[PDB]
């Protein structure tokens, strides 16, 4: 449990994460569903407990690079994922991207549109250069 | 269509003795056949369903036997209300419904 | 047409095997003896040969395999004499629960049509828009 | 002796179609449900008529403690077709699919060729608050779709008058795959020491309202009134003020006219069946039949057949097919030779006089 | 006593005029009326993904999809253009001024009461009460800026629409301009238009006492400033009464914001139908890819797999085309809103029935979810 | 007691239409199918039509298919038979018969009505 | 132009003329043409709103004075003509 | 290929029997026509947006060039005085 796992529960084949739930399952009920007909809960055959099924982690990656003649440094933005979940994923090496951007600790930022790795944070304000999202912009600036 | 042939077109017996009627089917119908009693001017009355089972409220003098395509109907003792026309009807082939030609039982 | 290379595979099989021999089929011959690729681009040829693979008193020269650990990949051979393992006994021999992988394809002049010594050769091409080492009779005109 | 008065079924007879949990949903299903407000046959007791069974049956009954034990299903209720028995005693249940002989009242007299004996907890649960006024009302639903006898139930001492109006779902109890054939239904009575409400299920579409724990609070029939479809086309239970386009309407056709210029199109069937000098088998006359409409009733009335076997076509299906050409080979032959004449046969006629090809598409006719 | 009746419409109240060769009708009194106008500015930004939607983590399905050409790169450009266009719409509508101004610490503009529309420091969002009513009356099915991942397992009960859309790979992106800095933009614009007049919209901001700005607007509508300077208290009281009563008008009405809610509902319904299309067979053996691969031979399973591909991709094409049409209509509305702001807010417009019914004086902008609200 | 009374018959010209009715009482009419059976003079019984217990399933004899229409009304316990394009051979007496499920949906005619005569002539 | 002809195309009738099997197989493609019916409904409502916006710009219906002498200006070609049953100006009549 | 044996019609016509060639031919036709339909639809959308821009340009020219406009922030930032048009490839340029 709690590890992204493959299951074959009596015909149900799929990936997900299983936790405890506070459902009010009737004794007769066996399965779970939602508005758009997707399984979201399964009663454990033993111990009679209801386990929810979260999907896996997925999203989009966007590299925010400056002009290519001016530098070669880039920063990666994993969209829609808590940056501790992606951080352990980089550490565990279980992600589809084989390209790995350096994580020096000074380059971490949990934004509202995802988390960006490769650029550092300040507390100043400038005219927006490239739009990142949720009130954040990036730029190439002299140190 | 299963055609239903009445071996005796018309039968003549005096009251008291036994009368035997025969009805044949073109194909196998297992034991699915019925007999009906029909006096001149009245509505048909069911006698035997399943070729071997007597209907409710009917005296034991009526009996039948046979399976497949050869069927027989037997009355042990003919009485005053037994001289009528008897029809044999199949119901194994449910989609259509066929009836026999009919046998006339009359006083000798 | 023009074909870069042509591959000819020849083998003698029985009558029902001719129906069996086809891309993406089932059977012991189709899964352990010879498997064609799903995207096969070629021709298969079968003709009855009861005069070369038959004689009086019989002829058990030919062979075929029914026991293999896994399926046969397309265009991959598996010539070997390794006794099939049944369960966990490491038996190396013939008899109980350790069988010879291949059995006789014995042929006699008097069998049924489905049991006659059918001779089968397959032809395989890789046609595309490419150079050719195989061609057809056609003279070459002059360039204008 | 029993009565057959009539009552209104009201809103009742809703079960759980499947085994999937829902919460705060308005799922819509299509299945066999007892319709909304309609007539049910209310019986009495003080003989036990055999009601029909088709597309399931809804059973309801209110009683003090117990007067009804079980049910018997199956066909012919005799020792010829498989049958059922769900008699319930004071402690257990006796589900069995067998070939009982008949009882006329120690409820069966034959168990020769039958299996699938089943026993479980008793169905009837009866509770009383130190008084008999808590009339236990039991609602049962049975159906036989693709075998798999399903039984639903819900036990509650409702107000106690009769078939009530308040909504109540039904929780499944058993699901056993008998699946033989069921056409009849009968109810057993007590032995020695105001019910019988029967309704019939029909294929309809229902909208069921779910609670947040997975129970069914309410439902809406999809074909009861001009409303109840508005609530379905934008699925919900509250419809604002306005006008909604729900469905369409179409009138049905009444008659059928088959008018034609002329249609006799006489075939030579009469000329081949009314002949007087049918040639012998050794020289079989072959007549070519074309440019005519083949009505097989003219062949039906002309000959009292003794062998009308057909191979490539059905004897019943001949007037609904169009043939490029028809060949009628006629020859008088002996009795056993009638059975001899057939595709893939042998004999002095099938080899030397007339051989029928194995791929023969047609019919043969023999009459004495 | 209640029923449904059918009647023919009445075009309006029957009225007649009294034209004559020599007769005039000159008003001797006036009134101040504050109307409202609501316009959508942008819609929810979504970014669908191919492959995962059509072939759930299947290598064979991906290989089969590769044979269809570049049908997954042209559907990854329309959505991006739509999102960028939405952001541009918001920028055009709201970011009309370059410098942010601030209301003076004291609030005495010659008797005019502006507390209803001015920012409220006590609230932590720094929004006017009128903006608060607009916020509480609009419900968003998906905020987007929620990072709701991590509570699908904590949903406990059946998962909502958002968790299911995540299950099917349909995401929503958050807008660049958060709703707090949009409110700050509107506050700066309102302070500029109620302190410096209309000069800040053209050049540098020049301060002008509010009674004088009101007098010059009166002069612009064709009535001399003497009228305002003689009955300043009456017009101040009428302004206060109108401002007070519009709040109750918005509070008591069932739904005066139907346009924004319609936008949200349309987007959510389109997404829900796209998700629901994932469970239809389209004429195949079954609607589950994992099932028709272990029940059918590979050489034949391809024909059944190549029905789900076309069904899913056609559904996606209809979704993207409908989204493009919706984006075009939203862009037209956003351009109209930007023009209306630049005309009525940063000056006084002579066009009839443009900035509200009657002779125009001013207008105040207010921020609404996925839209703007004017107070003519 | 169960009573099946037919009505609506009479004399008619060729090519016209007639409607018959069979009122039912004394039994739970809504849970049984019914049958129409005709008997030409000097001939045996002939099956004509059938309608199920609700009305969705109906079957017709090949001789009357496309011309005869059968329907019921559960709210009044009556059975109808609409006839169109009557020909000479359609002269007979028509019986309405109750059905009792046996082996198949309906195979036994348990109670028969008195019947009504229909004749067609010029 | 102010509006266009309103249409209400019907799926099952168009695609499968009173054919049960054809309608059943149309039902296999899911909710495909429900969007089409909704789009046509939206088109109709939009057309009605268009004509309402363009024409119903006033709330009280006035009438011309019984006498038509507006300082010498002759408008007899644009005000409604009482004799015509449709109550339309000659310019409107030519347009029709 | 769109799921056929090959993407060249001349290749797939000389490598299959005519009764079976039609099956592989009737995939290229549908793929090509869906591509064409997608192209024409995006072209119609682009034409609509370009027409809106052209109407705005014509209005701006007629207002700012042939007169002086009182509308704020329409003919450039600030109080408007004139405007001069200049031709550009597939467009126009104003000098407010
Ligand atoms: C113009 O109209 C105003 C309201 O629309 C009038 O003001 C009213 O004044 C009375 C007192 O006289 C108040 O009781 C009332 O609430 C309102 O404020 C105003 O008098 C009127 N002007 C003239 C000249 O009549
Ligand atoms: C401007 O208008 C405000 C309306 O929001 C007035 O606030 C009022 O404050 C009183 C208490 O003093 C409340 O009872 C009332 O509900 C409202 O909130 C404000 O006083 C007013 N100020 C001026 C100068 O006109
Ligand atoms: C306004 O213009 C009308 C034109 O339609 C005049 O009516 C015409 O009158 C002439 C006679 O002079 C007719 O021959 C013609 O058919 C039409 O009716 C109308 O007199 C005129 N009225 C005024 C007040 O100028
Ligand atoms: C590279 O880009 C920078 C951006 O300002 C520019 O100054 C520089 O001239 C560019 N290099 C070349 C070779 O043009
Ligand atoms: C940077 O500014 C933030 C406020 O946004 C403040 O909390 C932080 O302490 C500042 N950093 C330093 C080094 O002072
Ligand atoms: C080597 O590979 C070829 C091609 O797959 C195969 O036919 C052959 O059997 C392989 N070698 C051996 C010794 O099996
Ligand atoms: C129930 O029966 C009564 C009387 O027989 C009748 O009036 C009523 O219409 C019937 N109900 C329905 C739903 O047909
Ligand atoms: C009821 O039937 C069960 C099943 O055989 C049996 O065990 C039990 O003793 C019976 N109870 C009574 C009271 O007969
Ligand atoms: C016993 O009954 C089963 C089920 O009907 C049937 O398949 C089987 O043939 C029967 N056997 C005998 C001997 O009657
Ligand atoms: C049940 O009856 C149907 C219809 O006659 C028949 O097809 C089926 O085989 C029967 N089932 C059994 C188990 O006899
Ligand atoms: C039970 O049997 C006894 C003896 O015959 C009889 O007196 C009694 O009435 C019976 N009880 C019932 C309920 O029939
Ligand atoms: C559903 O569960 C809640 C939480 O325990 C409870 O308060 C409520 O009574 C339950 N309702 C039903 C119908 O079970
Ligand atoms: C063919 O038969 C029809 C029906 O009897 C008749 O009306 C018609 O006149 C006949 N054909 C000709 C050409 O006479
Ligand atoms: C021959 O035709 C006549 C005239 O209709 C008919 O009476 C007779 O039954 C026919 N006989 C045969 C054998 O067809
Ligand atoms: C077929 O030929 C035989 C030859 O004996 C003849 O008797 C018979 O009448 C013929 N049948 C026809 C012409 O229909
Ligand atoms: C206006 O003057 C004209 C002059 O001919 C006269 O006919 C008309 O009656 C006058 N208007 C009124 C309302 O009297
Ligand atoms: C990511 O953000 C924080 C920090 O880890 C925490 O709430 C959790 O891990 C993630 N957020 C959610 C909502 O799951």
Author numbering:
A (entry chain B): 535 to 677
B (entry chain E): 1 to 108
C (entry chain C): 390 to 482, 484 to 534
D (entry chain A): 23 to 68, 80 to 138, 158 to 210, 212 to 246, 263 to 437
E (entry chain A): 689 to 1064
F (entry chain D): 1 to 122
G (entry chain C): 728 to 823
H (entry chain B): 969 to 1064
From the paper:
The currently dominant variant, BA.2.86 sublineages, with over 35 mutations in Spike (S), showed higher immune evasion and formed a distinct BA.2.86 sub-lineage branch via phylogenetic analysis of the primary sequences of S.1 To mitigate the spread of epidemic and impact on public health, a large number of monoclonal antibodies have been developed and deployed rapidly. Here, we found that two δ-class antibodies, XG2v046 and XGv280, which recognize the conserved epitope of NTD and can enhance RBD exposure and S1 shedding by promoting RBD to assume “up” conformation as a neutralizing mechanism, have broad-spectrum neutralizing effects on SARS-CoV-2 variants. In order to identify the epitopes, we determined the structures of BA.2.86 S-trimer in complex with Fab fragments of XG2v046 and XGv280 at 3.40 Å and 3.75 Å resolution, respectively. The epitopes of the two anti-NTD NAbs are conserved among VOC, VOI of SARS-CoV-2, and even RaTG13.
Interestingly, two NTD antibodies, XG2v046 and XGv280, neutralized the full spectrum of SARS-CoV-2 variants ranging from the earliest D614G to the more recent JN.1 with medium potency. XG2v046, XGv280 and XG2v024 share 6 identical residues (Y28, P85, N87, T108, T109 and R237) involved in NTD interactions. However, unlike XG2v024, which locks S in a closed conformation, both XG2v046 and XGv280 placed RBD in “up” conformation, with the binding of XGv280 triggering the opening of RBD at a larger angle compared to XG2v046. Such conformational transitions were distantly regulated by binding sites on NTD, rather than masking fusion peptide and did not interfere with recognition of hACE2. Perhaps correlated with this, we observed low-resolution structures of the dissociated S1 trimer in complex with three copies of XG2v046 or XGv280 Fabs. To further verify this, we compared the spike cleavage efficiencies with or without treatments of XG2v046/XGv280 and observed dramatically improved cleavage in spike when treated by XG2v046/XGv280 as evidenced by the ratio of full-length spike to S1. These results unveil a neutralization mechanism for XGv280 and XG2v046 by facilitating spike cleavage and early S1 shedding via allosteric regulation. S is higher than that in BA.2.86.1 So, shedding of S1 subunit was more difficult for JN.1 than BA.2.86, which can explain the decrease in neutralization activity of XG2v046 and XGv280 against JN.1 compared to BA.2.86. Compared with antibodies which were not mixed with XG2v046, the neutralization potency of the mixture (anti-RBD NAb mixed with XG2v046 at a ratio of 1:1) against BA.2.86 (IC90) or JN.1 (IC50) increased 7.5-fold or 7.2-fold on average, respectively.
